[PDB]
C-alpha cells in the first residue's frame, strides 16, 4: 500500500474501515464524506464516491455490519445523525451513489460520537453529544432501514455542560459476543462502562479513574481468549491509559478496574487510540504528526514499539 | 465561557438590540422596551438600566445625530426618540415619519451624513427622509418586498452615499443617493427570499443570506465565498476593523428558531467557525460594541456579552489525527497527514497514510542486520491445520479420544514443521507428549506438577493469548476445552466467535465453514438454528413442501434395515400432498435432485452446467423457459 | 505523497538477533543454584565420581562469572 | 427489486448463505466470489453470487461459494447436516 491524497478541502476528522478492509470512509469538516475502494490491480486507492452529507463539520463516522448492507452513519455539528445506504446502480464519483436513509435530529446539542453496536445485538446505534445524554437507536425490524426508534436515553452527566465549546465525547462498544452488553462513555473527564441488566435498561458498571483532562478517544479491545479486557483512552493532557477490565459472573457481572499502564510519551495532545484485532498492539496518534504503536512486554506493562513520522 | 463578561436578566420580552455609537459612555439600546442598558467593567454587570418608556430592528444614529434611536411600534411609521429628552417634564417624542402603506421591515441611520436615514418594507418603495425638517426621495423597487436595507459604512480608521437592498425575489439591488430610481448594480443573490444584507467595513463587499442557507459574498466595487450553513440565516453583523484582505473578515452568522446560536465565522476558513458562543436559550440579535466585545439578546431575555480575544478557538478543539487497524500484523494502518492552518491568510489536501507495517518492518530489520507475508501464513495455518476432533465404555472412549488427539497434535506439529516455524512445533510437541502421558496413566489405571496435562496446556494457552497467537489458542480451545476446562465457556465461545469474524474479514469463507461445521459449541454464530433453510411451497397445489410422510416412511424402512442409503431418497423436489413427481431443469428438462441454480426474477431451477452454459457459453440474457424480462449474466 | 519516517524502538527480532544465548537467565529465575549445585557436588564426591562435581561446579562458577583460594599460591 | 430481493409482506431478507452468512438474493456483495475474454470472466464473477440450493437438504449457498466448497469437500457446510450435495 501507499499513501494517497484525498480531495478534501479541510481537515479530515474521523476515518473508519469497513468490515473487510477494502473500503475507507473519510469524513471531514468541509461537509463531505469520501468513500474509497482498494483496487486489486496496481494496489492503490481510487475514489468511489464523494458527496455532501451535513451542513457543518462531520466529527464521527462508522460502518454497519456487512450482513445489514453498506450503511455508514455520520454525526456532525448540525445536531443530526444521517445514515447512508450505497446504491451500486449509480456510477462512481457521481455524488448520487449513497442515498440518505434517516436523520435522527433529536439531540439539542451537537453530536460528537456515533458508534454501531456489535452485529449480534441487531442493527443498534449509539449517539453522544453536547446535550449530555446517551441515545440508543435500534431497528427492531431490520427489514426496513428507515425505521429507527430511540430505545435508551441515559443521562451520563449529573449536569449538562455550561461550556459547550470546550467538550469532547467518545463511545466504544464491547465486541464480546457472549459477555453482557457493555458500552463505554467518555463524557468530559470521566469514563463509565454501561451494562444491560435484567431490567433492559443501562446501568453504571465501573468507572475508569484518573483522566485529568478531556477524553479525545476511547477504544475497547477485542480479547480473543484472554481472561481480561483492555480499554485504551487518549486524553487532551497527552496520556495514554490502558485499563485492565476483569469480569466475573441488576447487573449479571461485577467489574473491577485496574490501571495497567500509563504513557505520556506524546509530548502534546493525543487525538486517537485504536486497538488491532488481537487486542495486543495499540495505535496512538497525536497533534505532532506522530503515530506510536504500543505492545505489551513480558510483564503487564505496555511499551512503545515504533514511532511513525510524516515528514 | 472564558470570554463571557456581562450577563443579566430581563423580566419582559425583547425584540432587538443596538449599540449606542459613543466612545464616552458604555450603554446599549435594547428593543415596547427602550432601555439605556449600561455595562461597567468594574462589576461586569449591566445593572445600570435607564427605563426610558414586531418585524423590526432598533438602530441608533451616527455622527452629529449621536443621540437618536428609531423603533417601530404600530408597523406603519418610524418613531424617533432622544436619550437626552428622557425627563418627566420633557416630551419623550420626536416627530415621527409615516408614509409606508404596509409593514416596515428595516431602517438604518447613515454613518457619513447624519441628517439622512433609509428604510423599507412590504410597500415596495425605498424612501429617503431628512431629520432637520413625507419623504424627500422615493425609489420604486418594481414590486419587490424589501426585507433589509443597509447604508454603506463610513467607519473612520487610520463613502456613505450608496446603499443596497435585499428582496423576497432574491435580488440584490445596489443604489445611489445621487442616482434615484436607477439601481447602480443588480445581482441575483439567492433562490427564494433573501433575508440578510450587510456591507464589509473597509472594502466594497456585500455578504447576504436567505432561505437557501448559503451566505454568499458579493463584490460591488458567481459569488466570492459561499458558506453552506444549511439553515435559514436571519442576521449578519461584521466586526468593526480594518480588513486589508477580504478573507480576514470576522462575520457573525445567526439564525432564528429553536436552534439559534452566535456563530462568528472568519472568511479565511469558511468551513469551520471561530466562535460558537451559545446561550441557554435561542438568541435573536447580536451587535458589535467594538473590535472585541459582542453582545446578544435571547428568548430567555438575558443580555449576555462575550470577549472574542479571550475565547477558545473551535479549530483547536477539533480532532486532528486518527488511526485504525485492518488485520493482525498491520498490513493496513492509517493516519491523516493534515496541517492546521490559521484564520488569517487555504489548506493543502490532507494525505491519508496507508502503511504496510510488516513490509516496512522487514525492510528495516534486514537493513539493520546486514551491518514473510504473515497474512498468507495465517491463510496457510487456517487451511492446513486440524481444528476439529472429528463404565468401561467411558474409559474406552476417553482412550480413543486421547489417541486421535495425539494424532491431531502430530499432524499439527508436522504442518508447522513444513513451513519451518519451530516456536509452535515445540508447543505442539509439548502438547502431544502431555497427551501421551495422560494416555499412559489412563492405560496404567500441595500443588500439581508443571508437566501435568491440564496445567501445561493452560499455561501454553496463556502464553499464546498473551503473545498474540490467535491460531494456536483457538486450536487449543477446540481440541482441549471439554476434557480440560481451560477457561469459562463464555471466554472460549467469544474467542471462537472472534476467530470466525477474523476469518470472515479476509476472503476465507470456506475455512470458516470448515471451522463452524465441527465446532463443539453449538451457538457460536447465530441463535436461530437453521438460518440457511429454504422451505418451499408447491408450484402445483400451493401447500408447503415439508414431506413428513416420506421422511417417516424412509426412517421406518431404514430402522427395519441396516443401511443409511434409504434415507437419501428423501428430498424436497417432490410433493406428498399432490403427488408431484420431480422438478425439471429449465434447459434440459431432466430430473433435478441434489443441486440447483435459481433464476431470481422468474423462479426457475437448473443445474450448474446448464445455467452456466446458457449464460456464459451461449452468451444469452433471458431465462431458458421464456420470461418477459432480462435475467442477465 | 509525503515522506514517512519509521523508527523501530526495542524490536524483538533485532534483540533476538543480538543474543548469542538460548536463554536470558537471571539470578531471579534461579535463586538457589549455588547451594543446590554445591550440595550435590558434595554428594557426588561422597560417591566415586570426583569429575562430575568438578563439571557441575565449573558450570555454576561459569554462570556466576557470567552475571558478575584452594588452587592458588 | 432488480438488485435486492426481500419478502413483500414484511421486508425481511432471504435465508443466509451457508458459507459466508450473507443474505441471499442480493447482488453487488462487498467481496468478490472468485469461485471454482474479460467479458466472460466478469459474467462468471457476477454469476457466482446467485441463489443456489440443494433439493434434498434445503440449504442455500452462493453459486461460487458452492462451487468452491464442493471442490474440496463432499458434505453440506451447515453444521448437523449429512447430505452429499455434489453427487
Ligand atoms: Zn404439491
Ligand atoms: Zn439441466
Ligand atoms: Zn424464467
Ligand atoms: Zn416475510
Ligand atoms: Zn455466500
Ligand atoms: Zn444440508
Ligand atoms: Zn443437500
Numbering used by the authors:
A (entry chain F): 1 to 249, 287 to 348
B (entry chain A): 128 to 158, 161 to 182, 211 to 290, 298 to 322, 337 to 399, 433 to 556, 654 to 679, 694 to 712, ...
C (entry chain C): 994 to 1061, 1073 to 1077
D (entry chain B): 937 to 972, 988 to 1038
Source paper text:
The SEA complex (SEAC) is a growth regulator that acts as a GTPase-activating protein (GAP) towards Gtr1, a Rag GTPase that relays nutrient status to the Target of Rapamycin Complex 1 (TORC1) in yeast. Here, we solve the cryo-EM structure of the native eight-subunit SEAC. The SEAC has a modular structure in which a COPII-like cage corresponding to SEACAT binds two flexible wings, which correspond to SEACIT. The wings are tethered to the core via Sea3, which forms part of both modules.
